[PDB]
Structures are given as C-alpha cells and as structure tokens.
Paper text:
DNA transfer is facilitated by a type IV secretion system (T4SS) nanomachine, embedded in the bacterial cell wall, which is extended by a long hollow filament, known as the conjugation, mating, or sex pilus. Functionally, the pilus is involved in mating pair formation (MPF), linking donors and recipients at a distance. Conjugation pilins are composed of three α helices, α1-3.
In IncF plasmids, MPF has been shown to enable low efficiency DNA transfer via the hollow conjugation pilus.
Numbering used by the authors:
A (entry chain A), B (entry chain A), C (entry chain A), D (entry chain A), E (entry chain A), F (entry chain A), ...: 6 to 70
The structure:
C-alpha cells in the first residue's frame, strides 16, 4: 500500500546516474575552474572535476534508486 | 478500543523506513551539495549525505512503527 | 456520582501514552527536521526528535490517566 | 432554607478537583503544545502544561466546594 | 422497527468510499496545491494529496456503512 | 444507485490529465521562473518546471478518473 | 466535451515561443547584466542571456501548446 | 491574435541598439574606469569599455527586435 | 412556448461581447494597475489587462447568446 | 438597443488617452522616484517613468474607446 | 467634456518644473551627500546632485503639463 | 497659485549657504580627519576639508534658493 | 416650480467653499500628519495638506452652487 | 447665514498656532529622537525637531483661521 | 478660551529641562558607550554623551515651555 | 509637581558612581585586554583600563545625579 | 428649578478626583505595562502611568464638579 | 458617600506592593532573560530584572493605595 | 485577605532556586557553547556557563520567594 | 511538590556526562582539526580536543545532575 510508487521511473531518469543534469553540473565545473585559474594562477582549481566525479558515484550507491 | 488503529499499515509504507519519500530526500541532498561545492569550494558540503543517513536510522528506531 | 466516568477507557487508548497519534507526531518531527536541514545546514534541527520525546513522557505522568 | 443545597455533591464530583474533565483539559494542552512546537520551533510551548496545573490548584481553593 | 432503514443503499453509493464526490475532492486538492506551489515555492504544498488519502480511509472504517 | 455518475465524462476532460488548464499552469511556471531568475540570479528557479511535472503525474494516478 | 478549448489559439500567440513578452524578458536581462558588470567587475554577469535562452527552449517543449 | 503587438516600435527605439540609454551606460563605464585607475594603478581597468561594447552587440542579435 | 424569449436582443447588446460595460471594466483594470505599480514596484501588476482579455473571450463562447 | 451608449463621450475625455488624470499619475511617478533615489542610491528608480509610459500606450489600444 | 480640467493650473504651480518642492529635494540631496562623504570617504557621493538634476529635466518633458 | 511659497524664507536661513548646520558639518570633517591621521599616518586625510568646501559651493548655486 | 429652491443660500454658506467646516477638516489633516510623522518617520505624511487642498477646489467647481 | 460661525474663536485658541497641543507634539519629538539616537547611533534622528517646525508653519498659513 | 491651559505646569516639571527623565537618558548613554567601547575598541563611542547634551539644549529652546 | 521624583535615590545607588556595575565593567576590560594581548602582541591593549576610568569620571559629572 | 440637583454630592465622591475607581485604573496601567515590557522589551511601555496621570488632571478641571 | 470604599483593603493585598503577583512577574523576567541570553549572547538581557524593580517602586508611590 | 496566597509553595518548588528547570537551562548552555566553539574557535564561548550562574543567584535574592 | 521531577533520569542519560552526544562532539572536533591543519599548517589546531575535554568536565560538575 505505497501511494507514491508510480513516480520512481520518471524520477530515476530525470534526476539519476544517467541523466543530463549531472553532465551539465560537471561541465559547469570545468568552465568555472578554467576561468578561475586564468585569473589567480592557483593549482587547487585543476582538480575540481575529479573530486566531484567520485563524489557523485559514492552518492548514487547510497540512495539505491 | 483504539479508534485509529486501521491506518498504521498504510502510513508505515508511505512514510516509513522503506519508502520512496526518504530516497527522494537523500537524492536532493546529493544534488544540492554538488551544486554548492561548485560555487564555493568549501569542503563542508562533501559530508552532507552521510550525516543525514545516520540521522534517519536513529530516528526510525525511536518511533517503532 | 461522576457522570462522565464511562469514557476514560476509550480516551486512554486513543489519546494516550501507547497510541498511534503520538507516533505520527514524532514521525512528522523526523521528516520536517531532515527537510529543513537539507535547505539550511543548521545543526539545531538534528535534536528535534529527542526534546519532544522527553517532553511527552514528562507530560503523561502529570495527567495520570 | 437553601433551595439548591441538594446538588452540591453531584457538581463536586463532575466539575471538581478530582474529575475527568480536568484531566482531559490538561491532556489537550500537552498535545496542542507538541504539535505547535513541531511547526514553529518556539520554546514558549514547552511550559504550557505547568502553568495550567498551578492555575487550577489556586482556583479550586478559592471556590471551596 | 427502524424507520429510516430504506435509504442506506442510496447513501452508501452516493456518499461513500467508492463514489465520485471523493475523487472530485482529491482532484481539487491536487490542483490547489500546484497553483499555490507556483506562487510561493513552499514544499508543504507537495504533500497535500497524500495526507488526505490516508485520512479518508481511516474515516470510512469508523462509520461502517 | 449513484446520483452523480452523469458528470464524470465532462469533468475528466475539463479538469484532467489531458486538459488545457494543466498546460496553462505549467506555462505560468516557466514565465515566473524566468522573471525571478533575471532579478535574483538564484539557481533554485531553474528547476521549477521539472518538479511540477512529476508531481502532476503522481497525482493523477491516485485519483483514477 | 472540453469547455476551455476555445482559448488556446489566443494564449499560444500572446504567451508563447514566438511572442513579444519573451523578447522583452531577454532584453531586460541584457541591460541588467551590463549595468551590474559596470559596477562590480564580476564575470558571472556576462553569461546571463545565454543560460536564459536555452532554458526557455527546454521549457516550451515540455508544455506542447 | 497577438495582444501586445502594438508596442514593439516604441520599445525598439527606447531600449534598443540605436538608443540613448546604451550610450549613457558606455559613458559611465569610461568615467568609472578612469577614476579607479587613478586610485589603484591597475591595468585591468583600461579594457572596460571594449568588453562591454562587444557584449552589447552579441546580445542584440539574440533578441532580434 | 418560451415566455422570456423577447428580451435576448436587448440583453445581448447591453451585456455582451460588443458592449460599453466590458470596455469600462478593462479601462478600470489599466488604471488600477498603473496606480498600484507606482506605489509598490511589483511586476505582477503589468500583466493585468492581458489575463482579463483572454478570460472574457473564453467566457462569451460558453454562453452562446 | 444599447442602453448605456450615451456616456462614452464623457468617459473617453475624463478617463482616456488625452486626459489630466494620466498626466498626474506620471508626475507622481517622477516625484516618488526622485525621493526614493535620494534615500537609497539604487538605480532601479531611474527607469520608472519610462516603463509606465509604454505600458499606458499598449493599454489604451486594447480598449479601443 | 473633461470634468477635471479646472485644476491643472494649481497643480502645475505646486508640483511642477518651477516649484519649491523640487528645490527642497535637490537641497536634501546635497546635504545627505556631504554627511555621507564625511563618514565613508567614497567618491560616488560627490555626483549625487548632478544625476538628479538631469533626471528631473528629462521627466518634466514627458509629462507636458 | 503656489501653495507652499510661504516657507522658503525659513528654509533658506536654516538649511542654506549661511547657516550653522553647514559649519558644524565642516567642523566634524576637520576633527575626523585629525583623529584618523593620528592612527594611520595616511596623507589622504589632510585634504578632507578642502574638497568638501568647494563641493558645497557648487551645490548651492544649482539650487538657487 | 422648484419646491426646494428656498434653501440654497443657507446651504451654500454652511457647507461651501468659504465655510468653517472646510477649514476644520484641513486643520485636522495637519495635526494627524504631524502626530503620525513623529511615530513612523515616513515622508508620505508631509504632503497630506497639499493634496486635500487641490482636491477640494476641483470638487467645488463641479457642483456649481 | 453661517450656522457654525460661533465656534471659530474657541477652536483657534485650542487647536491653533499659539496653543499648548503643538508644543507638546514638538516636545514628544525631541524626546523620541534622543531615545532612538542612544540605541541606534544614526544621525537621521538629530534633525527631527527642525523639519516638524517648518512643516507646522507652512500648514497654518494655508488654513487661515 | 484655551481649554488645555491647566496642565502646562505639571508637564513642564515632569517632561522638561530640569527633570529626572533627561538625566536618566544621559546616564543610559554613558553606560551603553562604555560597554560598547570595551567590546569593539572604536573611538566613536567616546563622544556620545557630548552630542546628546548640546542636542537637548537646542531642543528645549525651540519649544519654549 | 514632579511625578517621578521618588526614584532618584534607588537609581543613584544602583546605576551610579559608587556602584557594583561600574566595577564589573572595568574588571571585564582588564580581562579582555589580557586575553587579546596574549594572542596578538599589540600594545594598544595595555592602555584599555585607563581610558575607560577617566571617561566614566567625566561622564558622571555631566549628569549630576 | 433644577430637577437633578440632589445627586451631585454622591456622584462627586464616587466618580471624582478623589475616588477609588481612579486609583484602580492607574494600578491596572502599572501592571499591564510591566507584563508587556517583559514580553516585548519595548520602552514605550515604561511611560504609561505618567501620561495617564496628567491626562486625568486636565480632565477634571474642565468638568468642574 | 463613597459607594466603593469597602473593597480597598482586599485590592491592596491582592494587587499591591507586598503581593504574590508582583513576585511572579519578576521571577518570569529572570527566567525569560536567561533563556534568551543562552540563544543570542546579547548583554541587553542581563539588566532586565533591575529596570523592572525600580519601575514598580516608582509606580506604587503614584497610586497611593 | 490575600486571595492568591495558596500557590507560593508549589511555585517555589517548580520555578525556584532548587529546581530542575534551572539545571536544564545551565546544561543547555554548556552544550551550545561546546558546539559553537568547535565551529568558530572563538574564546568568548568558554565563559558562558559562569556568567549565567552568578546571574541566576543575584536574581533569586531580589525576588525573595 | 515539584511537578517536573519525573524526567531527570531520562535527561541525565541522554544529555549527560556518560552519553553518546558528547562523544560525537569530541569526534567532530578531531576531524575538523585534522582537515584544517592539512590546509593551513597552523599549530593552533593540534590542541583542539584537549581544551574541549577539560571544559566539559568543569561544566558537568557545576550542574550537578
Ligand atoms: C539549464 C542550462 C544549464 C547550462 C549549463 C552551462 C553552464 C556554463 C557556466 C559557465 C559560467 C562561467 C562563469 C564563471 O566562471 O565566473 C566565475 C564565477 C565565480 O564567482 P565568485 O567566485 O567570485 O562568487 O562563477 C560563479 O560564481 C558561478 C557562475 C556559474 C553558475 C551558473 C551555472 C549553474 C548551472 C547549473 C545547472 C542546474 C540545473 C538544475
Ligand atoms: C516530488 C518530486 C521530488 C523530486 C526530487 C528531486 C529533487 C531535485 C532537486 C535539485 C535542486 C537543485 C537546486 C540547487 O541546488 O540550488 C541550490 C539551492 C540553495 O539555495 P540557497 O541556499 O541559496 O537559499 O537549494 C535550495 O535552496 C533548495 C532547492 C531544492 C529544494 C527542492 C526539493 C524539495 C523536494 C523534497 C521532496 C519532499 C516530498 C514531500
Ligand atoms: C493523519 C495522518 C498523519 C500523517 C503523518 C505524516 C506526516 C508527514 C509530514 C511530512 C511533511 C514534510 C513537509 C516539510 O517538511 O515542509 C516543511 C514545512 C515548514 O514550513 P515553514 O517552516 O516554512 O512555515 O513544514 C511545516 O511547516 C509543516 C508541514 C507538516 C505538517 C503536517 C503534518 C501534521 C500531521 C499531524 C497529525 C495530527 C493528527 C491529529
Ligand atoms: C469529550 C472528549 C474530549 C477529548 C479530549 C482529547 C483532546 C485531543 C485534542 C488534540 C487536538 C490537536 C489539534 C492541534 O494541535 O491543532 C492545533 C490547533 C491550533 O489552532 P490555531 O492556533 O492555529 O487557531 O489547536 C486548536 O486550535 C484547538 C484544537 C483542540 C481543541 C479541541 C479539544 C477541546 C476538548 C476540551 C474538552 C472540554 C470538555 C467539556
Ligand atoms: C461539482 C463539480 C466539482 C468540480 C471539481 C473541480 C475543482 C477544480 C478546482 C480548481 C480551482 C483552482 C483555484 C485555485 O487554486 O486558487 C487558489 C485558492 C486559494 O485561495 P486562498 O488560499 O488565498 O483563500 O483556492 C481556494 O481557496 C479554493 C478554490 C477551490 C474551491 C472550489 C472547489 C470545490 C469543489 C468541491 C466539490 C464539492 C462537491 C459537494
Ligand atoms: C485563464 C488564462 C490564463 C493565462 C495564463 C498565462 C500566465 C502568464 C503569467 C505571467 C506572469 C508573470 C509575472 C511575474 O513573473 O511576476 C512575478 C510574481 C512574483 O510575485 P511575488 O513573489 O513577489 O509575491 O509572480 C506572482 O506572484 C504570480 C503572478 C502570476 C500569477 C497569475 C497567473 C495565474 C494563472 C493560473 C490559471 C488558473 C486557471 C484556473
Ligand atoms: C512592458 C514594458 C517592458 C519594458 C522592458 C524594458 C526593460 C528595461 C529594464 C532596464 C532596467 C535597468 C535597471 C538596472 O539595471 O538596475 C539594476 C537592478 C538591480 O537591483 P538589485 O539587484 O540591487 O535588487 O535591476 C533590478 O533589480 C530589476 C530592475 C529591472 C526590472 C524591471 C523590468 C521588468 C520588465 C519585465 C516585463 C514583464 C512583462 C509581463
Ligand atoms: C539618467 C542620467 C544618466 C547620467 C549618466 C552619467 C554617469 C556619470 C557617472 C560618473 C560617476 C563616477 C563615480 C565613480 O567613479 O566612483 C566610483 C564608484 C565605485 O564604487 P565602489 O567600487 O567602491 O563600490 O563607482 C560606482 O560604484 C558607481 C557609481 C556610478 C553609478 C551611477 C551611474 C548609473 C547611471 C546608469 C544609467 C541608467 C539609466 C537607466
Ligand atoms: C466640531 C469640532 C472639530 C474640531 C476639529 C479639531 C480636530 C483636531 C484633531 C486632532 C486629533 C489628533 C489625533 C491623532 O493624530 O491620532 C491619530 C489617529 C490615527 O488613528 P489610526 O490611524 O491608527 O486608526 O487619527 C485618527 O485616526 C482620527 C482622529 C482624528 C479624527 C477626529 C477629528 C474629526 C473632526 C472632523 C470635523 C467634522 C465636522 C462635521
Ligand atoms: C496629554 C499629555 C501629553 C504629554 C506629552 C509628553 C510626551 C512624552 C513622550 C516620551 C515618550 C518616549 C518613549 C520613546 O521614546 O520610545 C520610543 C518609541 C518608538 O517605538 P517604535 O519605533 O519602536 O514603534 O516611541 C513611540 O513609538 C511613541 C511613544 C510616544 C508617543 C506617546 C506621546 C503622544 C502624545 C501626543 C499628544 C497628543 C495630544 C492630543
Ligand atoms: C525607569 C528607569 C530607568 C533606568 C535607567 C538606567 C539605564 C541603564 C541601562 C544600562 C544598560 C546597558 C546595556 C548595554 O549596554 O547593552 C548594549 C545594548 C546594545 O544592543 P545592540 O546595539 O547590539 O542592538 O544597548 C541597547 O541596545 C539598549 C539597552 C539599554 C536600553 C534600556 C534603557 C532605556 C531606559 C530609558 C528610560 C526612558 C524613561 C521613559
Ligand atoms: C553580571 C555578571 C558580570 C560578570 C563580569 C565578569 C566578566 C568576565 C569576562 C571575561 C571574558 C573574557 C573573554 C575574552 O576575553 O574573549 C575575547 C572576546 C573578543 O571577541 P572578538 O573581539 O573577537 O569579537 O571578548 C568579547 O568579545 C566580549 C566577551 C566579554 C563580554 C561579556 C561580559 C559582559 C559583562 C558586562 C556586565 C553588564 C552588566 C549589566
Ligand atoms: C473592580 C476591581 C478592579 C480590580 C483592578 C485590578 C486590575 C489588575 C489587572 C491586571 C491584569 C494583567 C493582565 C495583563 O497584563 O495582560 C495583558 C493584556 C493585553 O492584552 P492584548 O494587548 O494582547 O489585547 O491586558 C489587557 O488586554 C487588559 C487586561 C486588564 C483589563 C482588566 C482590568 C479592568 C479593570 C478596570 C476597573 C474598572 C472599574 C469600573
Ligand atoms: C499563575 C502562575 C504564574 C507562574 C509564573 C512562572 C513563569 C515561568 C515562565 C517561564 C517561561 C520561559 C519561556 C521562555 O523563556 O521563552 C521565551 C519566550 C520568548 O518568546 P518570543 O520573544 O520569541 O515572542 O518568552 C515569551 O515570549 C513569554 C513566555 C512567558 C510568558 C508566560 C508567563 C506569564 C505569567 C505572568 C503571570 C500573570 C499573573 C496574572
Ligand atoms: C524539557 C527538556 C529540556 C531538555 C534540555 C536539553 C537541551 C539540549 C540542547 C542541545 C542543543 C544543541 C544544539 C546546538 O548547539 O546548535 C546551536 C544553535 C545555534 O543556533 P544559531 O546561533 O545559529 O541561531 O543553538 C540554538 O540556537 C538553540 C538550540 C538549543 C535550544 C533548545 C533548548 C531549549 C531547552 C530549554 C528548556 C526550557 C524549559 C522550560
Ligand atoms: C548525529 C550524527 C553526528 C555525526 C558526527 C560525525 C561528525 C563528522 C564531521 C566531519 C566533518 C568534516 C568537515 C570539515 O572539516 O570541514 C571544515 C569546516 C570548516 O568550515 P569553515 O571554517 O570554513 O566555516 O567545518 C565546519 O565548519 C563544520 C562542519 C562540521 C559540522 C557538522 C557536525 C555537527 C555534528 C554535531 C552533532 C550534534 C548532535 C546534536
């Protein structure tokens, strides 16, 4: 008797591991990092996209959708 | 002579430990954390999904539904 | 010559220490706290369910139903 | 020559210090306070049942039934 | 010798668990919630249809028509 | 003996899943979001139309008209 | 038996993909961005008109008017 | 059946490519840059008017008024 | 044998699609919107006359006078 | 057989495009904007009289008095 | 048949281009600017009276009283 | 028919070129500059009273009271 | 054959342009404005007596007593 | 034939230019300003009594009692 | 014929130049200044009691009670 | 006829020159200064208690309680 | 021939300057002010009893009983 | 001939200087201040009980019961 | 003739010097201070429980319950 | 007659010296210190867990639960 069971499918494909939103977030990270590195010359901005990637992976395994 | 005993079943499966609402809350946490980390570069946002998980567990054992 | 003595039983089992209404109130507290913590990142919301629990206990001993 | 002297007994046991109505009023106070605290997070609602209790005591000593 | 026994049938099918009025009430809830969420951006409006559903169920079991 | 059975058809096509009112609500959401994003520059307004869409779907399956 | 079918045409041409309101919103974005960049010298304001454009496109395909 | 078609002309000549407001914005940029360069001696302020100019051009071609 | 058939003509020209009352209502809307926008500076008042117009159209087609 | 046709003339000259009320509204806008700019130093108040002007024009063409 | 034509004269001399209210507004601007410059040492306050002057001029030509 | 013409005299002598308020503002500038120079040893504070003086002069000629 | 012609004189001097009632209304406005300005510090109260004056003038010319 | 001419004298001396009420209003202004300045340290409160004084003067000349 | 002339005496001695309320206000200023200086180490708080004193003097001469 | 004359005594001994509150303020100053000097090694913190002392003296002579 | 002259004495001592009712009103004012100040921390409540006192005095001199 | 003289005694001992109500008000002040100081860390809450005490004293001397 | 004398006992033991509420307030202070010190590293939070303790003592001696 | 005596036990074991919350606070301190030391290389972060420990001890002895 679960009254919100009908939506998982949609959610899983719009906000999920294989979805467009996630790729847009990672693309934004790349561009922000490049623009900041040009202005400050600080190496901490060259790792940005890596730490996010691993993070997202570890996250989606805890939800189990 | 308990007059609201008939509903527990439904409640327990719609708002419970094994329910879709809880997974949607945790998914929202992941996405909010990623978007905030991209804009501020602050590490406090990388722990978000963990502290929530433990919290929910400790909560559902106190209700005992 | 008490004219409302016949109802205590029912009341005590519908609005009492061992009743479904109380568990629904505590469950609502858990869910509200999680949703608020996700949006504000403020630790005051992680204690909610504890303070309510003790409160209810201290209350039901003063009524003595 | 008091023409309403016959009823005190009944009144004293239905609307009195040791009566069911008073316990139902205090129980309602507990429940209202918990539900309001969950929605507002304001501490003024955690004192409700105390101030009522003392109040009722001081009242019943002035009537002297 | 029950003088209003003839009507239950009609009532049970016009104002009952399986009736059109109940579905119209739940539909109104959905639409009101969507319109309010668009104007305020407050999440309390996304739960509306669930709490009503459970409520109606628990109600119709107490009447026993 | 259901006395309001004659109207479902009309209702289902005027206030339903495939109806004009729903599309006008979603269009209003798009426009409100764009105007607010221009003035505040806050990303929470870029998700508006998605969360509403899923919501409506999950709603219309619970009514079953 | 749809009772509001007569208006779509008008709506689609006044609040639509090819309408004047949308162009006025995008023009406002350009001007706000220029005035803010002059006062703060922050590059985040140089992307404004792009993100809005894509957004509107993705929106109008979900409504399907 | 476009109900706001009558205004484009006026808008296009008051808030447009060939309008006085745009020239006042660029003039303000020149003056702000000179005053800031005098106080800080930083070369980033000598490019201000160029980047704005190109920006406005690219903007007005996307609106197509 | 319709006993009120003689009046439609008059009604249709005094309270109708092409009548003076409707234009006075729309004129009042324009003036109220301008006066409110001057005092609050809120954009919701700039759409008033549009939503009314479409509304009236959709209405007069349902009456069919 | 239009029973309110006699008044348009008067209305059109008292509440119209060429009327004193409209000029008083625009004058009030100028003065309010100046007084607010003096106290806050915010540029949004320097555009007030323009947006109103265009608005009124677009309005009076939809009424067609 | 203009019913408010009798007042323009008075208005034009009390709230107009050559009126005392306007001079009091500009005087207030001068004094506010001096007091703020003394406390912050920020040059943006030295232009205040100029931008207001031009503004008022451009305004009074659009009203045409 | 100017309805606020009676006050200029008073205003001109209380908030004017030859008034006490202006001298108090300039005196405050002197004292603030001395106290700041003692703590920072920065020469920009030794010009304060000059730039204000010229400013006030140029201001009072634009008001023409 | 006008049956109420005898009273105009009296009316015109008791409720008229040159009458005591009007001066008492304007005096009340002055006092209310001062008391409100002292408590709120809002400038809208400093214009009160002006707008009323013009209003009364424009009114008495429309009656023509 | 003015029927309320007998009272002006009294009014003019109780609610007038030379009356006690006006002095009490100005005294209240002084005290409110001092108490607010002590708590906020904002200079806008040091001008209060001046602006009121001029205001009252300009008011009493328009009434002409 | 002044109807509130009887109270000046009392007022003048309770809310006046030589009254206890004024001394309590100045004492509060001293204490607030000391406590704030201890926490911030900012010299603007060492002048507080002086500026208030002069202010009160200049005020009481304008009321003339 | 001074209506608040009865309290001076109490005030003068609780908030006065010879009172405990003043000594607690000076003690707090000593402790804050020592803790700050330990962390920054800046000599400006070694004068704190002196400047406060003189200040309080000069203050209490202006109140004259 | 005054037909109600016999009662003044009684009235003057029950509702008068030296009567118990007046003291009860002033006592109520004190208590209300204290309770409100405790809950809001707003200084306007500390003046209550003073303004009432003067008021009553000025009132009883106008009646002359 | 004072008709309410019989009650002063009772009033004076229930609502008076030496009464329980006053002590309960002061106790409430202490507790409210402590709870607020814990949450905000603002020193204004540490003076609460003092200012009330003096206030009550000054009040009871004006009533003279 | 004190009508609320019967309650002091209860009050004195529930809201008093030796009561559980006071210990819960001090415990809350300890926990809040520790959590804040962990996040900010500011020493002002290490004194919290001391200043409250003394405060409560000084308070309970002024009430004298 | 202590009305909240029933809860101490629970409180003492959930918020106490031997409780899980305290250990979680100290664990958080360790982790925050390590992460900060890695990024800044400042030795002040290596003492964190010690100062907290002593603090908590000294606190729990003052409450005496
Ligand atoms: C729906 C369409 C999505 C389209 C995705 C394309 C994204 C392209 C973004 C490129 C922007 C580059 C701008 C930039 O680098 O400026 C630097 C600023 C730094 O500002 P700050 O650190 O000084 O406060 O950086 C910032 O502060 C933030 C600016 C960038 C944030 C906006 C992008 C958010 C999109 C996230 C999508 C969420 C979808 C639900
Ligand atoms: C029923 C369908 C549920 C679908 C669940 C999908 C959720 C996907 C959400 C992704 C949104 C990402 C937006 C974002 O990151 O923006 C950042 C903002 C921060 O705003 P602020 O901190 O500046 O005030 O973040 C915010 O402030 C909050 C924005 C996100 C909150 C909306 C999500 C709430 C859904 C909870 C479901 C409750 C169900 C009863
Ligand atoms: C009879 C069936 C009971 C079913 C119980 C299931 C409860 C599940 C509730 C989950 C709701 C989550 C919504 C949420 O978190 O939104 C946050 C808002 C906060 O609003 P605000 O602070 O901005 O004013 O939060 C709020 O403001 C309040 C929203 C939640 C209140 C509704 C729940 C009340 C049920 C209490 C039952 C009483 C029974 C007599
Ligand atoms: C004879 C049988 C008695 C049974 C007693 C059981 C009582 C259980 C009550 C639980 C109700 C909880 C509902 C609740 O908390 O909602 C909050 C509202 C607040 O409304 P508002 O503040 O926004 O106006 O709260 C309210 O506004 C008031 C709602 C509660 C009032 C109804 C209870 C009155 C019973 C009193 C008995 C009198 C007997 C003569
Ligand atoms: C017999 C045919 C039934 C047809 C059912 C279709 C229902 C469709 C309703 C859609 C209406 C949407 C309007 C809306 O969302 O406006 C918001 C307002 C909120 O007003 P407020 O909160 O500001 O006071 O919302 C409101 O305040 C209430 C407006 C909606 C209430 C009217 C619907 C009641 C129908 C119930 C049927 C009962 C049958 C016995
Ligand atoms: C029947 C014809 C329907 C036609 C549909 C076209 C809708 C087009 C709407 C475009 C309006 C844009 C205005 C806007 O963005 O202003 C922002 C405001 C925000 O106000 P606030 O947040 O500051 O209180 O936003 C608001 O607060 C709300 C303003 C918009 C609400 C009005 C639209 C409601 C239509 C819903 C239709 C219901 C049908 C039953
Ligand atoms: C119907 C005729 C439409 C005419 C369209 C022409 C638009 C031209 C607008 C140019 C305004 C430039 C002003 C400006 O840049 O000031 C900056 C402010 C920023 O304020 P803030 O960030 O400090 O709160 O910016 C703001 O905060 C917002 C100010 C701009 C908002 C007003 C424009 C809204 C028009 C939207 C049309 C909706 C139609 C339904
Ligand atoms: C309608 C008439 C328009 C007249 C146009 C003439 C503009 C002349 C402006 C010259 C101002 C020079 C002042 C200056 O350089 O000071 C520097 C400050 C920097 O402040 P900050 O960086 O320290 O926060 O700079 C600033 O922070 C901003 C100060 C300048 C902003 C005001 C100009 C805005 C006019 C835009 C017109 C919009 C029309 C809708
Ligand atoms: C026949 C003799 C006439 C004597 C004329 C002398 C008038 C002197 C009036 C001075 C009253 C000042 C009181 C005041 O300022 O209080 C403010 C209140 C505001 O109340 P609110 O806004 O909070 O609802 O303000 C108000 O709300 C209204 C209070 C004032 C209204 C009473 C005056 C009406 C007289 C009009 C004469 C009509 C003759 C037919
Ligand atoms: C008939 C006898 C008249 C006696 C005149 C003596 C007046 C002495 C008044 C001194 C009061 C000082 C109180 C004070 O400064 O508190 C500040 C508050 C501010 O409140 P807020 O801004 O936070 O809403 O300030 C306020 O909000 C308003 C409080 C003061 C208003 C009351 C005085 C009104 C008297 C006007 C006389 C009218 C006669 C018709
Ligand atoms: C009738 C008896 C009068 C007794 C007079 C003795 C006054 C002694 C006051 C000493 C209080 C010291 C408290 C203090 O310094 O705290 C600082 C706060 C600053 O708060 P903030 O700036 O952070 O908002 O400071 C504040 O924000 C304000 C706190 C002080 C305000 C209360 C004193 C008002 C009394 C005025 C008397 C008016 C009589 C009508
Ligand atoms: C009623 C009992 C009074 C007991 C008096 C004993 C006072 C002992 C205080 C010792 C505290 C030492 C703490 C310390 O030095 O920390 C440094 C901080 C500096 O903070 P910041 O500069 O980084 O913002 O310093 C601060 O920022 C401020 C912290 C100290 C302020 C609290 C003391 C105020 C008491 C004043 C009494 C007023 C009575 C009405
Ligand atoms: C004949 C015996 C008289 C005995 C006199 C003793 C009076 C003692 C009164 C103490 C009551 C304290 C209660 C209190 O402070 O509560 C605050 C409320 C405020 O309510 P609100 O502002 O939120 O609407 O305050 C109020 O709203 C009003 C509550 C107080 C009003 C009742 C007192 C009226 C007595 C007047 C005597 C008239 C005799 C003809
Ligand atoms: C007859 C028996 C009397 C018993 C007296 C014992 C009193 C004990 C009270 C302890 C309550 C502590 C609660 C507290 O501190 O919460 C803080 C709130 C602040 O709320 P806010 O500022 O956010 O609106 O604080 C408040 O807003 C107000 C809450 C406290 C007010 C209730 C106490 C009133 C009793 C007055 C007695 C009057 C007798 C006629
Ligand atoms: C009846 C049972 C009582 C049980 C007592 C146990 C208390 C344990 C409390 C531990 C809470 C720790 C939470 C915490 O430290 O979070 C920090 C926040 C700071 O918030 P902010 O400064 O950012 O606005 O801190 C806060 O802002 C406030 C959060 C803590 C306030 C809630 C505790 C109040 C209880 C008082 C009892 C009154 C009884 C009448
Ligand atoms: C109920 C389950 C509890 C689980 C306990 C496990 C705690 C593990 C925490 C590890 C987090 C490490 C994150 C970190 O080091 O980031 C550094 C930031 C510094 O931020 P800032 O200084 O730049 O403002 O650090 C911060 O600013 C603060 C981030 C850490 C604060 C969150 C932990 C609070 C838990 C307290 C429990 C209270 C229970 C009532």
């Amino acid at each position: 008797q679960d009254l919100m069971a009908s939506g998982n499918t949609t959610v899983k494909a719009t906000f999920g591991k294989d979805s467009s939103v996630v790729k847009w977030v990672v693309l934004a990270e790349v561009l922000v990092g490049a623009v900041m590195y040009m202005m400050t010359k600080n190496v901490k901005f060259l790792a940005g996209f890596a730490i996010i990637s691993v993070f997202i992976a570890v996250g989606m395994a805890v939800v189990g959708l």
